[PDB]
Amino acid sequence: GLFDIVKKVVGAFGSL
C-alpha cells in the first residue's frame, strides 16, 4: 500500500 492510502491523505483537505 502506497497508492491507495495516498488518497486518504489528500482526502483530509478534500474540503478544508
What does the alpha-carbon distance between residue 2 and residue 15 come to, in Å, rounded to a whole number? 22
Task: Kindly report the backbone phi and psi dihedral angles of residue 13, in degrees, each rounded to the nearest multiple of 5, phi listed first.
Answer: -75, 15
Experimental method: NMR
- Alpha-carbon span 4 to 2, nearest angstrom: 6
Cα distance between residue 14 and residue 2, in whole Å: 19
The x, y and z cell numbers of residue 13, run together, are: 483537505
Cα–Cα distances in angstroms (integers) from residue 9 to residues 1, 14, 15, in the given order: 13, 9, 12
**DSSP-assigned states of every residue in 1-16:** --SSHHHHHHHHTT--
Distance in angstroms (rounded) separating the CA atoms of residues 1 and 4: 6
